[PDB]
Design a protein around this ligand. Structure first.
Ligand SMILES: CCOCCC1(Oc2ccc(Oc3ccc(F)cc3)cc2)C(=O)NC(=O)NC1=O
Ligand SMILES: [Ca+2]
Ligand SMILES: [Zn+2]
Ligand SMILES: [Zn+2]
Length: 168
């Protein structure tokens, strides 16, 4: 029919994700904790829930790659592009890739996977870039460290504009 359909958000509250493969730089459990905790950033302030699948099709498919890696948005080696994620949808919708030419950590050396993933998952949920330099959806990496991390209020207001508040 006449104009193109669109999808700025997910129709459902309960999302699945799958970790298709793993960076060399962190243990499986490290990576697992990072992604679990990146998702809890968003689920904490919305009705959204996130579950892990070990195999098959999930809403959010997460993998690690270098250079041309299967979607024609190539990566660029260390620095520059760090990761990307597709907005909500069927097929590639919500899918997150991380540049394995980067050095990813659970600390302050290299790129802290959790921070960069909590940013990619906003994209995965339909958030674009913020112009608030303090905001997590601000396209500049700033390091924070797990126990000091609070979702700033611009990413709160952003995501709750799409999905409303969570419990509380
Ligand atoms: C539309 C794509 O623009 C390309 C730039 C890009 O790089 C980053 C990706 C995630 C980042 O994560 C953050 C963002 C804000 C923080 F405070 C801490 C970490 C920071 C940079 C990226 O590589 N991939 C992204 O999805 N967004 C980014 O901003
Ligand atoms: Ca890169
Ligand atoms: Zn990709
Ligand atoms: Zn971004």
């Amino acid at each position: 029919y006449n104009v193109f359909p669109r999808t700025l958000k997910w129709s459902k509250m309960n999302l699945t994700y799958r970790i298709v493969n793993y960076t060399p730089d962190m243990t499986h459990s490290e990576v697992e904790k990072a992604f679990k905790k990146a998702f809890k950033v968003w689920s904490d302030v919305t009705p959204l829930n996130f579950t892990r699948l070990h195999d098959g099709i999930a809403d959010i498919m997460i993998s690690f790659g270098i250079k041309e890696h299967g979607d024609f948005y190539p990566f660029d080696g260390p620095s520059g592009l760090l990761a990307h994620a597709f907005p909500p949808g069927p097929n590639y919708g919500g899918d997150a890739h991380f540049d394995d030419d980067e050095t990813w950590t659970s600390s302050s050396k290299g790129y802290n996977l959790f921070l960069v993933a909590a940013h990619e998952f906003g994209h995965s949920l339909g958030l674009d870039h913020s112009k608030d330099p303090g905001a997590l959806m601000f396209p500049i990496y700033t390091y924070t460290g797990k126990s000091h991390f609070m979702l700033p209020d611009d990413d709160v207001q952003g995501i709750q504009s799409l999905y409303g508040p969570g419990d509380e």
